[PDB]
Amino acid sequence: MRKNIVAGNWKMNLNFEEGQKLTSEIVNMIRDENIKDVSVVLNPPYVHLHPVKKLIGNTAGLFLGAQNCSDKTSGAYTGEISASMLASFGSTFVIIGHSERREYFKEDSALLTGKLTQALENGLTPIFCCGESLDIREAGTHEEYVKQQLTESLFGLSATDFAKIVIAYEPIWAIGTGKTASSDQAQEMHAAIRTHLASKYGQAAADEISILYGGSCNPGNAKEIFSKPDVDGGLIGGASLKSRDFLDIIKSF
Amino acid sequence: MRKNIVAGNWKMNLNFEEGQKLTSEIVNMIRDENIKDVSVVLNPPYVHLHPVKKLIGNTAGLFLGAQNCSDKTSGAYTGEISASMLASFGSTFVIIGHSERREYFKEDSALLTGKLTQALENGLTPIFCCGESLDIREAGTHEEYVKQQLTESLFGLSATDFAKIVIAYEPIWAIGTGKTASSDQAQEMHAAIRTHLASKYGQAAADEISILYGGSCNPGNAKEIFSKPDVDGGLIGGASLKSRDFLDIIKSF
């Protein structure tokens, strides 16, 4: 039995006042609507975790994440944030390997495993992001490329550490390129992922992992995307910044 | 009117509870001893800014900083923190170009300029870091290497924007290498820096800039280093994490 998850990735958006307004609206609506079978995760910038954690309070099904963490435990890494820091501030999730960090900071598969180890070591549920860019699609090697990403970063994990992870598939090729990904293409990639993970850990273990769609996911298309059997929710982008749109997506299962 | 500055760079150290007790110790002793003629800056990790700002309160001469900021204003840069965010959470300083980011994240002079633009745009005092490694010392190019760093990142700045900057010199060649930098060697580099800043902006303006020593700086040698005419304080490493050592450095002018 997988969990349905909606993870809001604010990215580098919102100052203190704006983050408080957004959070308070989401918490109020989540506490009043008492959504039963969906885990919601707010992934604001580092600076927001402490006050956002406070607004969440003891809301059921609402969790605090984060957008990145160091592969190191602690030390002389000015500007970096460790997994132990995130946990201490109330984080229980952490996005690892987002396309935008692979791109601008050249996070390779080895580095992302180190991050995974730190997250798991510190009680964080990693949201491990994979996905192929447009060149990979144009080469027709998209399914091998994404399965290759998963093999190099995840197939070192124990059976018990694997059961702790969440996957997000980002159709990088379909974001700002003029190419579009259909809900069938998302289901196609998600199933390719689950079958690949089952090949190593067994079908029962693969059938418990939440694989979230990380492409363009909004109130308009959320129901159709979430309707797919191997899509277990979404890693939301710009709709994370609008409390109403975010709640609409949450209510789309 | 150069200000003497003691800026504490926690690097990637300390959880929520540790950063609060360290901060509550620094604040208590600054208030009780009535420190008057020193600017004290705490640069904790991003996650601590919000609670640390509260503890700082209206403590005179005690300010909140940060260890890095993005070169972009906002948007799809997952994991990154903007200068407006920092300003929003109480930061009035920010370290830019620290040696550990130049190394591990390959931050070049073209990127640091963007960070500088963002910092000043948002009312932050940038603590621009520079320094030369051991291989540069052995090459005999230490002074020109450091000057090139300053030229490449700082000389695009207006006269009014230059007046708002703080410099930190990191003797990377003398940090964990087995080599030692005397207080005269530090003075020599600080003097070389000031004269190089005066090449573009004039001696009067250069004589207004706080140039902080970023090498091994602690209660054992603070007074001798700070006594040097072109040393205006320190960018402190490990001693930042011990409230008594940090206060002893503050009282070493």
CA pair distance B220, B252, nearest whole angstrom: 10
Helix H or strand E encompassing A166: strand A166-169
Which residue shows structure tokens 């994991």?
B79
Instruction: Kindly determine whether residue A47 and residue B46, on different chains, have CB atoms separated by under 8 Å.
Output: yes
Alpha helix (H) residue ranges in A34-170: 49-56, 83-88, 99-104, 109-121, 134-138, 142-154, 159-162
> What is the identity of the amino acid at A242?
K
Displacement of CA B64 from its chain's centroid (Å): 12
Q: Which of A151, A167, A236 is nearest to A207 (CA)?
A: A167
Whether B170 sits among the annotated catalytic residues: the reply is yes
Residue A164: exposed, middle, or buried by beta-carbon count in 10 A (0-12, 13-18, 19+)? middle
- How many degrees, rounded to 5, is the angle at CA A140 between CA A136 and CA A146? 55
Contact A29, A55 (CB under 8 A): no
Q: In whole angstroms, give the CA distance from residue B47 to residue B56.
A: 15
* Resolution in Å, one decimal place: 1.5
CA distance A175 to chain B (A): 12
Tell whether A50 lies on the interface with B, counting CB pairs under 8 A.
yes
Rounded distance between C-alpha atoms, residue B189 and residue B132, angstroms: 10
Residue B79 with chain A: CB contacts under 8 Å: 12, 67-68, 95, 98, 100-101, 105
Helix (H, G, I), strand (E, B) or coil at A40: strand
A96, A126 contact by CB (below 8 A): yes
| Euclidean distance between CA atoms B126 and B14, whole angstroms | 23
- DSSP bridge pairs for B125: B93
CB-based contact, A145 to chain B, within 8 Å: no
> Cβ of B36: how many Cβ atoms within 10 Å?
8
**Rounded Cα gap, residues B239 and B253, in angstroms:** 16
Domains and CATH numbers, chain A: 5-250 (3.20.20.70)
In the three-class reduction of DSSP (H, G, I as helix; E, B as strand; rest coil), residue A33 is classed as helix
Alpha carbon A77 to its chain centroid, in Å, reads: 25
Contact yes or no for A77 and B104 at CB 8 A: yes
Q: Tell me the shortest Cα–Cα distance from A27 to chain B, in angstroms.
A: 20
Task: For the beta carbon of residue A210, count every other beta carbon within 10 angstroms.
Answer: 19
Tokens of A91: 């984080």
The residue assigned the tokens 């694997």 is: A162
Query: Max Cα separation, chain A?
Result: 48
Largest pairwise CA distance in chain B: 49
DSSP B119-163: HHHTT-EEEEEE---HHHHHHT-HHHHHHHHHHHHHTTS-HHHHT
Cα separation, A6 vs B193, in Å, equals: 52
Angle formed at CA A149 by CA A200 and CA A223, multiple of 5 degrees = 85
Asked if residues A107 and A129 have their Cβ atoms less than 8 Å apart, the reply is: no
Q: For chain A, how big is the Rg over CA atoms in Å?
A: 17
DSSP code at position B53? H
Q: How was this structure determined?
A: X-ray
Q: Is the dihedral of CA B9, B13, B16, B20 positive or negative?
A: negative
Number of Cα atoms under 13 Å in the Cβ half of residue A89: 35
| Cβ contacts of A165 within 8 Å, gap of 6 or more | A116, A125, A126, A128, A154, A157, A209
Structure tokens at A215: 């492409």
Determine the residue among A11, A22, A42, A85 to mutate to test chain B binding: the one whose Cβ has the most chain B Cβ atoms within 10 Å.
Answer: A85
CA atoms within 13 Å, Cβ hemisphere of B216: 14
A176 annotated ligand-binding residue: yes
E strand spans, chain B: 5-9, 39-43, 62-64, 93-96, 125-130, 166-169, 211-213, 233-236
Residue of B nearest to A102 (CA): B78
Q: Is B230 exposed, middle or buried (0-12, 13-18, 19+ CB in 10 A)?
A: buried
DSSP, residue by residue, B58-97? T-TTEEE--S---SSSSBS-TT---HHHHHHTTB-EEEES
The nearest CA of chain B is from the CA of A199 a distance in Å of: 31
Residue A49: closest C-alpha in chain B: B47
B101 chain-A contacts, CB cut-off 8 A:
78-79
Annotated binding site of B: 9-11, 176, 216, 237-238
Q: Is the dihedral of CA A138, A139, A140, A143 positive or negative?
A: negative
Q: Are B40 and B63 in contact (CB under 8 A)?
A: yes
**Contact yes or no for B46 and A46 at CB 8 A:** yes
A94, A125 contact by CB (below 8 A): yes
Interface A–B counts its CB contacts (< 8 A) at 126
Q: Which amino acid, residue A236?
A: I
Of the candidates B251, B253, B250, B252, the residue with the CA atom closest to the CA atom of residue B6: B250
Q: With 0-12 CB in 10 A as exposed, 13-18 as middle and 19+ as buried, what is B180? A: exposed
> CA-nearest residue of chain A to B19?
A85
Computed on alpha carbons and rounded to an integer, the radius of gyration of chain B in Å comes to 17
Is A10 annotated in a binding site? The answer is yes
String of DSSP letters for B207-241: TTS-EEE-SS-STTTHHHHHTSTT--EEEESGGGG
Which of these, B204, B203, B210, lies nearest to B231 by C-alpha position?
Answer: B210
**Cα separation, A79 vs B44, whole angstroms:** 9
d(CA B184, CA B190): 10
**In what helix (H) or strand (E) does residue B247 lie, and over which residues does it extend?**
helix B243-250
Separation between Cα atoms, residue A123 and residue B203, nearest integer Å: 55
Which tokens sit at A123? 């009680």
The Cα of A10 is separated from the nearest Cα of chain B by a number of Å equal to 8
Distance of CA A104 to the CA centre of its chain: 18
* Residue A55 to residues A24, A30, A79, B22, B215, Cα–Cα distance (Å): 6, 12, 26, 25, 41
At residue A65, φ and ψ (nearest 5 deg) are -115, -140
DSSP state of B203: H
Q: Who among B11, B74, B95 is closest to A75 (CB)?
A: B11
The C-alpha atoms of residue B24 and residue B38 are separated, in whole angstroms, by 18
The closest of A203, A201, A205, A237 to A218, measured between CA atoms, is A237
Chain B residue with CA closest to A52: the answer is B50
Of B68, B72, B100, the closest CA to residue B86 belongs to B68
With beta carbons less than 8 A apart as the criterion, state whether B44 and B52 touch.
yes
Q: Is B228 exposed, middle or buried (0-12, 13-18, 19+ CB in 10 A)?
A: middle
Neighbours of A14 (CB within 10 A): 24
> By the 8 A CB rule, do B165 and B205 touch?
no
- The residues of A annotated with a catalytic role in the active site are 98, 170
A173 annotated binding-site participant = no
Query: Can you say whether the dihedral through the CA atoms of B77, B81, B83, B87 is positive or negative?
Result: positive
**With an 8 Å Cβ cutoff, is B85 touching chain A?**
yes
> What burial class does residue B149 get, using C-beta atoms within 10 Å of its C-beta: 0-12 exposed, 13-18 middle, 19+ buried?
buried
The answer to whether residues A110 and A159 touch, using CB atoms and an 8 Å cutoff, is no
Of B100, B231, B91, B228, residue with least CA distance to B166:
B231
Residues 63-82 of B with CB under 8 A from A: 67-68, 70, 72, 74-82
Cross-chain residue pair A47–B49, CB shorter than 8 Å: yes
Give the CA distances from residue B48 to residues A47, A185, A199, A210, in Å, rounded to whole numbers and listed in that order: 7, 42, 43, 31
A:104-123 residues touching chain B, CB 8 A cutoff: 104-105
